[PDB]
Amino acid sequence: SKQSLNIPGYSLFSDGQRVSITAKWTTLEVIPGKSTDMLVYEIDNEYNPVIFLRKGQTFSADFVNNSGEDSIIHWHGFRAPWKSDGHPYYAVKDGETYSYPDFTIIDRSGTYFYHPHPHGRTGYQVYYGLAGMIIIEDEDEDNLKQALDLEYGVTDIPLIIQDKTFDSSGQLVYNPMGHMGFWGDTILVNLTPNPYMDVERKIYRFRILNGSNARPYRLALLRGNQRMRFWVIGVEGGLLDTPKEVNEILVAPGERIDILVDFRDASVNDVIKLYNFPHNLIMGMADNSEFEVMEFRVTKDSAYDKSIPQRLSEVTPINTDGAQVQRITLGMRRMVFTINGETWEDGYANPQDINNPKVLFEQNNGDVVILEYVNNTGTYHPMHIHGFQFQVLERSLGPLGATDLGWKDTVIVAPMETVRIAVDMSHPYNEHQIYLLHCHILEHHDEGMMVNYRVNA
Numbered sequence: 216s217k218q219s220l221n222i223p224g225y226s227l228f229s230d231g232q233r234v235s236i237t238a239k240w241t242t243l244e245v246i247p248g249k250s251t252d253m254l255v256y257e258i259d260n261e262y263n264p265v266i267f268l269r270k271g272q273t274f275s276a277d278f279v280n281n282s283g284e285d286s287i288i289h290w291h292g293f294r295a296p297w298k299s300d301g302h303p304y305y306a307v308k309d310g311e312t313y314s315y316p317d318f319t320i321i322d323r324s325g326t327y328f329y330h331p332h333p334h335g336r337t338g339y340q341v342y343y344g345l346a347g348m349i350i351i352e353d354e355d356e357d358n359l360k361q362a363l364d365l366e367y368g369v370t371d372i373p374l375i376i377q378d379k380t381f382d383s384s385g386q387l388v389y390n391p392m393g394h395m396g397f398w399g400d401t402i403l404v405n406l407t408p409n410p411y412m413d414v415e416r417k418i419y420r421f422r423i424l425n426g427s428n429a430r431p432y433r434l435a436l437l438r439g440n441q442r443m444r445f446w447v448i449g450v451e452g453g454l455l456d457t458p459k460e461v462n463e464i465l466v467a468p469g470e471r472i473d474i475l476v477d478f479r480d481a482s483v484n485d486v487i488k489l490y491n492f493p494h495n496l497i498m499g500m501a502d503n504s505e506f507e508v509m510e511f512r513v514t515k516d517s518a519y520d521k522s523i524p525q526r527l528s529e530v531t532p533i534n535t536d537g538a539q540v541q542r543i544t545l546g547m548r549r550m551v552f553t554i555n556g557e558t559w560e561d562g563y564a565n566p567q568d569i570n571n572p573k574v575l576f577e578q579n580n581g582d583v584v585i586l587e588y589v590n591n592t593g594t595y596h597p598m599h600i601h602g603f604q605f606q607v608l609e610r611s612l613g614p615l616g617a618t619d620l621g622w623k624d625t626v627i628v629a630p631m632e633t634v635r636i637a638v639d640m641s642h643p644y645n646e647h648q649i650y651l652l653h654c655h656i657l658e659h660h661d662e663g664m665m666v667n668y669r670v671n672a
């Protein structure tokens with residue numbers, strides 16, 4: 216029987232007062248009638264709530280580690296000073312606390328992602344439950360919410376999509392084999408299996424966050440056999456300039472796509488499938504199958520008469536005049552993935568001085584750099600950088616679609632593809648920054664497909 220979609224609780228992070236976030240084990244009912252032991256972040260008496268922030272506020276956090284092993288939280292998408300970013304060098308032992316130095320939220324409104332980042336164990340800790348959404352608000356978001364009467368949990372809905380495998384008793388199975396990362400046989404949305412959500416004939420906002428270890432989704436909305444239109448309005452780095460109408464989106468681990476859906480396109484009593492088509496991005500456990508993710512049930516009319524806005528935000532093109540190119544070649548050396556022929560374990564893992572570790576490349580504050588990913592392997596890699604968003608300039612396999620527009624922080628690099636992104640490495644901090652660059656297939660990350668880079672003060 217289909218279950219109604221669970222909606223996460225939320226936490227309004229205090230502006231400047233220190234909030235405790237505890238990682239701990241508990242027992243949850245995920246499969247109806249069975250118990251599953253899972254990790255959770257507990258904040259403000261909620262498990263894995265959506266963290267709400269306002270641009271400009273002070274972000275003041277403590278991580279309390281009861282996860283059973285070294286851990287640290289990373290705020291995926293934040294422009295943060297690197298000692299507050301959740302770099303693995305700062306992971307604290309089990310039972311200890313990490314006090315994040317305060318910083319100001321300077322990111323654009325949109326959907327962000329908090330999750331653990333320990334050396335070699337990130338795939339395990341996300342998989343077993345440590346993952347949640349962040350929503351940052353600013354004036355463009357205020358204006359959009361009023362334009363459309365969007366309300367969190369009512370018409371503004373997180374879709375945290377994840378694949379897991381359960382045994383008979385309900386215990387999770389985490390058995391990565393091969394080099395495609397971990398692939399699960401059960402699709403969950405907000406830890407809800409086989410979900411449905413009742414909707415009215417009006418516009419909803421869905422915040423799709425791929426919280427899976429390795430599996431990408433090619434998502435469409437099926438009204439019978441026909442694809443329904445919908446609109447991309449935001450990506451990892453916030454709102455696009457104006458809405459982009461699509462009939463599918465490709466979403467890899469680490470990517471976030473904000474969409475609007477107008478169920479006035481459907482009729483009362485329609486069942487609309489959020490459906491996964493083959494991603495076509497691929498020793499391994501991967502598949503390329505199609506399957507339903509969840510369904511929307513149109514139960515009721517609404518007096519709703521708002522329109523999709525003509526404009527959302529300003530997105531300023533990066534000026535790449537004179538930018539230097541930094542080639543980043545993805546390869547493999549004896550069944551391990553490499554970045555410019557190296558792994559994390561080739562001199563990055565145990566620096567003598569964590570403030571001055573090995574870096575693959577180094578930039579000055581304000582440099583505009585073009586990173587050119589060259590995937591010389593047979594599997595895709597969703598390449599993510601900490602510290603900055605970026606703009607995708609070009610793909611060798613084709614033109615840019617809606618989910619690569621705007622400000623991004625994770626870019627799919629398909630097998631044998633070359634992708635150029637432009638990074639404006641301007642930051643407001645007064646010390647040099649050590650930021651990660653790595654694959655967001657979490658088993659690749661754990662195996663060392665990760666480097667530091669440096670941006671001076």
Ligand SMILES: [Cu+2]
Pocket residue numbers: 291328330469655
């Ligand atoms: Cu991440």
Ligand SMILES: [Cu+2]
Pocket residue numbers: 289290291292599600601
């Ligand atoms: Cu990140």
Ligand SMILES: [Cu+2]
Pocket residue numbers: 552595596597654655656659660664
């Ligand atoms: Cu990878």
Ligand SMILES: [Cu+2]
Pocket residue numbers: 289332599601651653
């Ligand atoms: Cu990371």
